[PDB]
A paper describes a structure:
The process of intrinsic apoptosis is governed by the B-cell lymphoma 2 (BCL-2) family of proteins, where dynamic binding interactions between pro-death (e.g., BIM, BAX, BAK, NOXA) and prosurvival factors (e.g., BCL-2, BCL-XL, [name]-1) ultimately dictate if a cell will undergo programmed cell death. [name]-1 is a prosurvival protein that mediates malignant cell survival across multiple tumor histologies. The large, hydrophobic, shallow binding groove of [name]-1 has presented substantial challenges for identifying effective small-molecule inhibitors of this protein.
Our efforts began with the generation of a crystal structure of compound 1 ([name])43 complexed with [name]-1. This compound demonstrated high target affinity as measured in a FRET assay. Inhibitor 1 makes extensive hydrophobic interactions along the BH3 binding groove of [name]-1 while also forming a hydrogen bond between its pendant carboxylic acid group and the side-chain of R263 in helix 5 of the protein.
Numbering used by the authors: -195 to 320
Write the structure that this text describes.
Amino acid sequence: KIEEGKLVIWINGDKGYNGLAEVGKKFEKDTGIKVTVEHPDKLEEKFPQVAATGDGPDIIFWAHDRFGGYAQSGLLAEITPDKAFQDKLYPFTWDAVRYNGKLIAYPIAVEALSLIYNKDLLPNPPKTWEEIPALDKELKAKGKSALMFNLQEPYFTWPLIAADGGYAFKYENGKYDIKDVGVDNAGAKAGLTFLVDLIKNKHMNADTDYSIAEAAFNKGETAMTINGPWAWSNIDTSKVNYGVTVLPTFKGQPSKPFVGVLSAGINAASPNKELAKEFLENYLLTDEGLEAVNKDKPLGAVALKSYEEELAKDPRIAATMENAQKGEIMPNIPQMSAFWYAVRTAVINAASGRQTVDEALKDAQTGSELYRQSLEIISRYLREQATGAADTAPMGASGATSRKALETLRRVGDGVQRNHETAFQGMLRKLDIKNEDDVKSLSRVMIHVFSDGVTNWGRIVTLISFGAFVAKHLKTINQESCIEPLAESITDVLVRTKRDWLVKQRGWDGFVEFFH
Ligand SMILES: COc1ccccc1-c1nccc(COc2ccccc2C[C@@H](Oc2ncnc3sc(-c4ccc(F)cc4)c(-c4ccc(OCCN5CCN(C)CC5)c(Cl)c4C)c23)C(=O)O)n1
Ligand SMILES: OC[C@H]1O[C@H](O[C@H]2[C@H](O)[C@@H](O)[C@@H](O)O[C@@H]2CO)[C@H](O)[C@@H](O)[C@@H]1O
């Protein structure tokens, strides 16, 4: 479906897309291949939908956090640069784009938020978040405000939520404990409560978004903002005497921004993969290519060592790296999209007063844990049904919920398979499942049948029960390796299509209560 002999690129509208188009024109001059750069709204949400049907751009740019989910869905081509090329970029940038041992994108630049301040209003920035209410009172008396930043995207509030101990997925001993989510701990509550109190005390407004905060800072109305390197170009045009510095501390601890590596992935459905690799390696990831993008909107600390050696001399880049070192590189696990949606809703609801901080972060914790919790129950049920023996591994975090949900699923799911054996057997025979490809075909039908019907626990149990019925068949035909992917497929469609309803039921605790 993607046209051969051209390149279509998607990049966010806050990045240097006109500079990127200049690199595309240089590519066309040599090869005669036209390069079209687009910046659609919500491109990070559109890409997984359109690429799943074989459509979409040839190349997608986004921070690396979204790319593990795309790679898990088979939407990205593996990238295999030679050693000479790999050595030109910092190794930690390649680490950001590695998923299941394979490189799935080219790293471009390292982005971290910093505190940006107007030196003409505030010659010295505040070192702590705690002093911002008094600074706002002093500035309000002269017709100014202390701080405005985007409150609609959780990326900007995360540094404050993480400062006193909030975390997305625990990281210790060089590994993630994906079962350990920290969005509703005391640290996360303290940071979000601080933000909500700034709004309650009229130091900030819940409706402030990217455009509003940018306009206020660039017009000299607010003394400070929180933003990344891409914002510096518009501040330069405004002529505000600005500085870029370390984010304020909270409870004496540094603010911890989630660090993104802007990366370029190649669509697995592209018939232009070799053209895309040539464009990215030999035109974009060069001093001249990155300089073209950087001159339109600054990239941050670029992954290309030769160019970064020059950019690192800029005090704004040193401040960006200082904030990056105090924060953490984002995970790229497929559940990052769910974590971001959950925290986005939590911040918006707490800031507006729709939910208290406790209610908001409890829902965010449920939403963030949903995939792993659902897979634990569904995988265990399918495998024990297929083999006749249960998994001996400990349940882990939220073990009581997992154990009680599995006990409930055994009672209700066994009843579904018993009573509906006729239709289940008839469907299993019509599907003629013999291998991995037949399981993938079953999964596509399963998605639309499940999604279009009514949302209730009885239909959710039927979906999972049919999965167990298929798992028994897979065991019989020596295709036991197909059971875990089937469990992942069932988990995917459940948590993706029914996300809001599942969170509203308190997840699997609601299921246990419903069938008590
Ligand atoms: C109060 O209610 C409850 C309380 C406790 C527990 C359960 C319930 C409950 N509450 C609600 C419903 C049901 C039982 O529903 C069924 C039980 C058995 C069969 C059907 C349905 C309808 C149901 O189906 C599904 N529900 C949810 N997710 C999925 S994903 C999926 C599915 C579909 C195709 C695939 F390839 C793979 C998977 C189906 C599905 C839908 C229809 C199906 O058969 C239709 C008849 N065919 C069979 C084949 N034969 C040759 C011709 C006649 C079958 Cl077998 C399946 C598995 C499906 C529904 O849509 O409501 N139970
Ligand atoms: O707000 C959640 C959002 O955060 C990050 O997105 C950043 C992006 O990394 C920056 O390059 C810039 O565009 O600002 C975005 C925030 O508006 C994550 O990369 C993204 O996945 C997540 O949804």
